[PDB]
Amino acid sequence: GEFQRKLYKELVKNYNPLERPVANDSQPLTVYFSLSLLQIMDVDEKNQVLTTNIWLQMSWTDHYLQWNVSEYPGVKTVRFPDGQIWKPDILLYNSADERFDATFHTNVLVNSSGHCQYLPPGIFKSSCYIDVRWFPFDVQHCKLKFGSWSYGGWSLDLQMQEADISGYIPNGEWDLVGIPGKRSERFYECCKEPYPDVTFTVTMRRRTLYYGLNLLIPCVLISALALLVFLLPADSGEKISLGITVLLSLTVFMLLVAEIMPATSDSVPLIAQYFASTMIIVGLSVVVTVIVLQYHHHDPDGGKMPKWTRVILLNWCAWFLRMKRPGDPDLAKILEEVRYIANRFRCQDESEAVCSEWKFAACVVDRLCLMAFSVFTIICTIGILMSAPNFVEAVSKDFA
Amino acid sequence: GEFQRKLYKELVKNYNPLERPVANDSQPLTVYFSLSLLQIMDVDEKNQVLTTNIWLQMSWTDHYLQWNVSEYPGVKTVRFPDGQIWKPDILLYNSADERFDATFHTNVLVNSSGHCQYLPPGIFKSSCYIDVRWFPFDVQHCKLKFGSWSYGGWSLDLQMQEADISGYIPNGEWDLVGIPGKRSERFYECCKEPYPDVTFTVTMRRRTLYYGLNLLIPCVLISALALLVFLLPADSGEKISLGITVLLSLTVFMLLVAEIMPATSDSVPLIAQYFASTMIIVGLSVVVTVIVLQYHHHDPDGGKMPKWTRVILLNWCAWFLRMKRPGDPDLAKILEEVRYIANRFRCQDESEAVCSEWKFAACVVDRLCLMAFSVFTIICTIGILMSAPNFVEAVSKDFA
Amino acid sequence: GEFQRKLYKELVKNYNPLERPVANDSQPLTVYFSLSLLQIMDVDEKNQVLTTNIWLQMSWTDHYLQWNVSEYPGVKTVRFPDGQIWKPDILLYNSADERFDATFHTNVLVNSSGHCQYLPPGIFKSSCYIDVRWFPFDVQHCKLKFGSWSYGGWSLDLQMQEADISGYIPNGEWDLVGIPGKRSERFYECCKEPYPDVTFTVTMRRRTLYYGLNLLIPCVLISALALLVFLLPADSGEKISLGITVLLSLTVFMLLVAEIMPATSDSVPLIAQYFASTMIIVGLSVVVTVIVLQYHHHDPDGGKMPKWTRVILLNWCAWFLRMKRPGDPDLAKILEEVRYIANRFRCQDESEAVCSEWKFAACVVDRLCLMAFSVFTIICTIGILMSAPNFVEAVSKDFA
Amino acid sequence: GEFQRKLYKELVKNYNPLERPVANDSQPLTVYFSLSLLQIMDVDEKNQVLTTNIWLQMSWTDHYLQWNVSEYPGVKTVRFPDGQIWKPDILLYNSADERFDATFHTNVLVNSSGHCQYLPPGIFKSSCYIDVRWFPFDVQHCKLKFGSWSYGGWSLDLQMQEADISGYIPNGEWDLVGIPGKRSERFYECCKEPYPDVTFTVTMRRRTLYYGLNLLIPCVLISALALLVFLLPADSGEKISLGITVLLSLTVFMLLVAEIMPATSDSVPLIAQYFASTMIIVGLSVVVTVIVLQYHHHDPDGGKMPKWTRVILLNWCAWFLRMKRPGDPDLAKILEEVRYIANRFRCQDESEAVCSEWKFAACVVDRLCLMAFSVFTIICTIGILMSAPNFVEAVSKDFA
Amino acid sequence: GEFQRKLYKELVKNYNPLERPVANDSQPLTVYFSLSLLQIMDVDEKNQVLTTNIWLQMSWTDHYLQWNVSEYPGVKTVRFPDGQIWKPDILLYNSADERFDATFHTNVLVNSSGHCQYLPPGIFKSSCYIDVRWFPFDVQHCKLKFGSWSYGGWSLDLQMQEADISGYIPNGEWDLVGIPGKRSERFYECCKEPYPDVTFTVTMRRRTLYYGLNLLIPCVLISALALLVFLLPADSGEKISLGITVLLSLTVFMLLVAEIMPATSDSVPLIAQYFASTMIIVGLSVVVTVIVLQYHHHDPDGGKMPKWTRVILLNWCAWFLRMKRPGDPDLAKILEEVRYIANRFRCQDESEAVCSEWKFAACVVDRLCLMAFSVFTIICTIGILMSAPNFVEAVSKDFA
Ligand SMILES: *[C@@H]1O[C@H](CO)[C@@H](O[C@@H]2O[C@H](CO)[C@@H](O)[C@H](O)[C@H]2NC(C)=O)[C@H](O)[C@H]1NC(C)=O
Numbered sequence A, B, C, D, E: 001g002e003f004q005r006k007l008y009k010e011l012v013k014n015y016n017p018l019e020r021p022v023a024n025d026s027q028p029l030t031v032y033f034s035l036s037l038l039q040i041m042d043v044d045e046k047n048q049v050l051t052t053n054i055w056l057q058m059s060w061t062d063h064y065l066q067w068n069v070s071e072y073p074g075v076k077t078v079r080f081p082d083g084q085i086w087k088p089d090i091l092l093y094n095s096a097d098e099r100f101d102a103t104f105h106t107n108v109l110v111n112s113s114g115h116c117q118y119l120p121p122g123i124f125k126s127s128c129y130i131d132v133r134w135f136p137f138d139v140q141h142c143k144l145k146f147g148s149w150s151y152g153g154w155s156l157d158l159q160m161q162e163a164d165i166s167g168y169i170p171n172g173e174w175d176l177v178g179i180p181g182k183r184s185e186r187f188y189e190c191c192k193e194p195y196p197d198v199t200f201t202v203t204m205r206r207r208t209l210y211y212g213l214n215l216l217i218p219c220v221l222i223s224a225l226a227l228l229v230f231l232l233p234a235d236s237g238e239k240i241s242l243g244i245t246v247l248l249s250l251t252v253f254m255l256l257v258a259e260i261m262p263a264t265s266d267s268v269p270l271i272a273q274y275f276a277s278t279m280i281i282v283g284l285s286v287v288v289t290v291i292v293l294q295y296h297h298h299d300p301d302g303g304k305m306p307k308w309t310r311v312i313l314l315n316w317c318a319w320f321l322r323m324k325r326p327g328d329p330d331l332a333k334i335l336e337e338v339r340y341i342a343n344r345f346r347c348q349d350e351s352e353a354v355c356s357e358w359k360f361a362a363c364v365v366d367r368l369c370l371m372a373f374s375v376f377t378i379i380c381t382i383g384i385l386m387s388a389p390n391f392v393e394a395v396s397k398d399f400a
């Protein structure tokens, strides 16, 4: 249109995009800064970066970009690309992208009275600390720090407006608790000019249904399965394979969880210590199995049963468990031969009678250690799982 | 040509690529927006990102870019590169590309009446929520949101033209149901103007043949083979070995299928339900095998058969399953030794006959659990697989 | 050079890089398009993306860029950079790259009479369909579709010339067969004017010396070793172990072959069919082994062999496979004691005879199933591998 | 303001951004260089690349950009963008980024007396030598070499200022020791002029809690479990299974650590030595188990035990380990028969005694090898771990 | 300063960066090309690309950039950024980078007499054929081809200087042998115009210590462990398990080697041949073990040993292997009963004698195959390992 042609010709006359558009040089320029969260793309525990989709929102007042609507009827807003008009050089301090500023440079909407609006979108790769002490029951606080790079207090001051989450799209993995900001200043040593900035802390809680169902219940189920070795009869000589096989499966599980995990040395992760507890449990199970197997295959002609073992395992450990202890000249020569055979059979029976005691002792030890291990595994898993804060309500909100 | 030289020189005179080319400044500018799908390149469920090849279609009527054909014979159209004429600032809202705009800027073809055509190509990475509840018998809807970034409804009013799929190249994995769009007018609280926008919802369906042949069926054969532990005779120890090795094969399968899919906590996936059910079936099979082995290797005098088991397993279950039960002074000394040997043999005979009942009971319970688990696996697999709403359609299309 | 400087100054007077350089505006401008293949960098079966290294060859005639050599002695050719002279806008229609035009903008060499040459190199990524129906004996045809984006057939007469392969560098995996090209005219829904394009089809054949050694031969070897169970005597305890470990190795092998290959549902790959057949073979091997184990440990005093089963196994197959079957008052008291002992021994001998007959039946069944499984796996492997077309030619070229 | 606009107009006048801003052309310009470490992001061992977040600091004195604040009251500082004033060309020599210069070009802040201050941020990837001889108890020294590219020592007098670590954010895995720097002068084959450069060395210590808990301790535990084969009675065939399965798990661990470790041939890693030692220990355990099993299943009436082995095993070693060694005509015909039976039984008893002595010898060998292997593995592990320098410092700082 | 500004203003008058800076247009311009190796970043065997840190080095003479120092006393050199002066267009012919020119454009230093220096750094990625026939004892030649893209003999004749390896930082895996170069001229069909270019060949030798300690030694050790199946007595039921688990471990080792190595089909790698040989050895080890097991569990009444086997496995090899072969009417009824019992025991004795003879034959076969396999494995290993060229050089330079 004719009027907007005239306006665009007139406005850029003697305009320098290198100057602050303030009527008075001494007075600072007021700039309002705010966010608009749209989505959380990914939270990388291993690399400790946070990727989000965010619309910035900056606004100020321009002294020179003013006109009277009466002289230019119909036109009431104008737009300018980058470089042609002055903009605040506000950029993220916590950036982790290769280019230090990931932000699409869009148009600047201008008032008929000098008020500019700037809403550039972009995908921001922050670098925030990822606490992993209570994984997978986590609450994370990642900070985004914005502010002018080469402008001070007398240059321009920054004011905070509350973050907008009206357009938030919920994420499958993380639950957004909130996003509160704060405006703070920082004085230097030379000069008493406040240097303001705005920081936003994004707080998220991990939803634990997936990690629970895929990590914890399988591991606890097969750890409970690992106690079946104490139920097998020792005569079926395939007890060791069970223990070693479940140990191998647990090792595979551990190395995968190490794969997902980062490599910080700040604290012992809950899942890692739980896996270590299961490691020790299965190892002690295998050791006890070897002990019982040694007891079962005892040589009858070897050493005698010690009195301590006899009085402990066969008496007290049986009372505790209420387990029952289930217990003519040639005529002389032929007589001697038959007597020899009978005596040999008697000796064989007496020798076999000894092995029964050892086998019963093996069964008793097996039952006792079964009970002890079954109690211990439950105690350990319950204590470790419930030791984490943010567990009861986490499970109540996820699994229910 | 001299005529096109003169025309190109004349058109750019006084032209301003900043002003919106309308004869009347008060009235808006109508812009027609459409789409042209070429192919779907990727659907990443783990990152929730859709990659497509798309040709944008825009069209508006410029005002100043007009000329008389008679004055410039031969010339019918002109072409302008980026930055030399006014273009709509149309952007994709939900984008996952690090650079927010992912369109290749090409020339604009302008007719002699002042009609501009803009057909920029590009590869678009938009983020859409990919439901995984009914995986792999899945149907997904992903939305693309387009619209001007900084032009209002009093200035630029979008219009819809139906999407073009004439050039579509079919995908191997995804079947395209269709891509219907819709035009809507959002209203601002300040002002009575509309804010037109156009959204395109791409609907696709996964083809269930690769997954069917590589994940579903192999698990069925492995689970079925896990029941071979029951037909096996307990005399040759292989039962626990069989059970555990099937278990680990299932674990590695579950690890694969877990690393394929994302960590969302919105619902339990169908494949997860199937694998968990197989987990439980194999574990219970191993437990039953342990019980059977305990029954088989029973000490002949370590106890007595309780009346409940003696009646049940030996008569009732044999009835149900139709299995038959498996069935001078120097001479008196010789007398008592020979009778002692005979008595020893008789005692051994009766003790050996005792264990036959225990072995038969083990066989009976083994057959019973075989039948029960054979029914259970079939029922569970059939129910879980047929629970999917479009299972019949998928099996009729992909397979038949 | 003064002459070079003066000519460069003169050639750019009133030159518009926006106009098509023709003497008469009505007739189109002829452009010859070719292509110089240099290297096939990579073929991505999983992503259906082909990466090649090519040099474009465009040539046309510029009417304004002419000069008389007699007045410019030394200079015979000139070079112009990007954006200073008119260039055709030719780009790939199939680019699977984040940027839709991956070419390095080099100079344009100009004749002394107005002929322009343009040879921009670059690495081109394109999306072409990949066939896995005959993996790894497949022949792939991929397409490269070039054309002007914004010039119709009335302004750009695109022509074609044969592709150049004189500098081709052979690849270590794919053997180049040829690269023809054909011109075509297409109508687009945008506009009522044909748009010519030039399509080059690259035909290449995969060499099968690496896959034949690392995916086929090991599978055959361990499938054959899976038949070693039928030789192993049942008196040992390592038959089920053999079978199930073979299954584990086979599953790992198939899983890796699955991860390398694309997830298409258009056909069942040859390697997939082979792996499924081998899975079935080993599974039935395990089932037969279970049956033989149950036969060999058959408990006597239970059910006698059926007449049909006996007359089959002990006679027909036994003769067929050339197998031979394994074949004072105290005196009265002493008398009936020794009578009891002798009768006990006689009954024991009868029981052992029945057991020996059962074990012979098991051996015969094992031998027969050995023969059947061996012949069946041989014929299935040969048939599956020889079903593919151009298999013998590939075998000859690669191995011999 | 008016003063700001006038000053910006005045400064730009007759300014060439190509000339070095010095009052005297023959005098070198002084530039102060400094660093500000913000965060160590990644230490890639395989690729030997260190990624850090760094702010560069540069400062010099421009001769032309000076003014009197009396004539320009409000304005005290001005800002200039890239490409409008002279800037140094300081760039990293060791950059490993695909684009050689990875820095964000910000404004340049200027005094009223011409003092320029330039603080460009950026994320720098540099190639530094990584030493893994003492992994995971290593201390690394990575250098960053900065310096002007095309400015010699007679024009740009580079100076170094101490690095700033006040804004350092501690990293979970790496511990910062110090960042000293020195300014050295070098000669290059290009030119006969010295080119000064500034090198900063980053010294980092690796926190070892993660690796100590995830790699060393589980390896220790399962290596110890591998010694249980010397407590299993030989009558249960489950010793080779134990040894070989632990060997398999060890091989898996070796594969994983080799995955983490880079391919280098400078010196053997400590963890590589540890895993090799564990390999040999477990292999020797398996060999000893094979020897013991061969001893146990001796066939009597065959090889008589040699006198040397007899005495060594059953006199000295057995006592040393406190092991106790275990241990009418018809009447004539019947006499002959009973004599034959008794003699056969006596021969069986003698064979049993020989078997018992062989089994006792096997047990003695087993116990002796158990003790030897235990002491050997303890000594080897403790020596290998303790050989690393500052291992005591590492454990004291991390664990305690 | 003053003279700097004056000279900079004077040097750009009427200066066209598009023209070749020569005094005579007909005569060509001499350009000297060179290189400066800094580091070999990576050698990718799979994608077959080479990454290096390189500073190019070009030098030529400019006719127009000349001045007399006495007129401008302070300035001796001037610097021009990209786009201000004429630069030769020299780029990598065989680059394998997504952008065809990975080169950082720095300043150009010009002397008082017109000499120009241009040393742009960069991280180049070139695709060079990588031979893998001799892995890991490998020597690779990679060629870098540089040349002009638009100029020829009458326009630009590239001379040569030897590549500079001063300041080259040794890599931990690849040892540099040399970087020879060679200039050459190529003529076109039309005209006798040379087209000189410079090519550099980088020759590097892989250091084999890491691969020897991670791939060769462990596989030899496990292969030797596989031979232990020939010392385990047949009574233990753990002979098949040993061989099978060795096969599994070696399969996963082959998997790793498959992942590291390229998928070429031009030769059979040495490591591939060695792994195939070891596979074959273990396979016949398992086959022989099965034969021995079926030989040892031979029923006494199932047949008789053939004469050939009886004479070759019991008299010839036994001596060769130095093994010794191990070795009133009621009274009549009582007599007949005891005669029956004695005859029964006699038949048992003959049976176990035949069984013992069969077991001796099995042991002899076992020892024979042990010796044969022990010789064969070492023969094949030595042959394959020493078959490679420069293997003595590799071991001498790495392990000493
Ligand atoms: C400016 O730079 C070039 C650098 O080469 C100088 O050329 C050298 O001049 C000396 C004088 O004898 C010769 O020995 C060298 O061989 C020349 N080098 C080359 C490549 O030709 C040139 O002299 C310098 N000019 C001034 C005024 O310093």
Ligand SMILES: CN1CCC[C@H]1c1cccnc1
Pocket (backbone or CB within 6 Å): B109, B117, B118, B119, C148, C149, C150, C188, C190, C191, C195
């Ligand atoms: C052939 N071109 C490429 C696709 C459409 C067509 C076109 C037509 C007009 C303006 N731009 C593109």
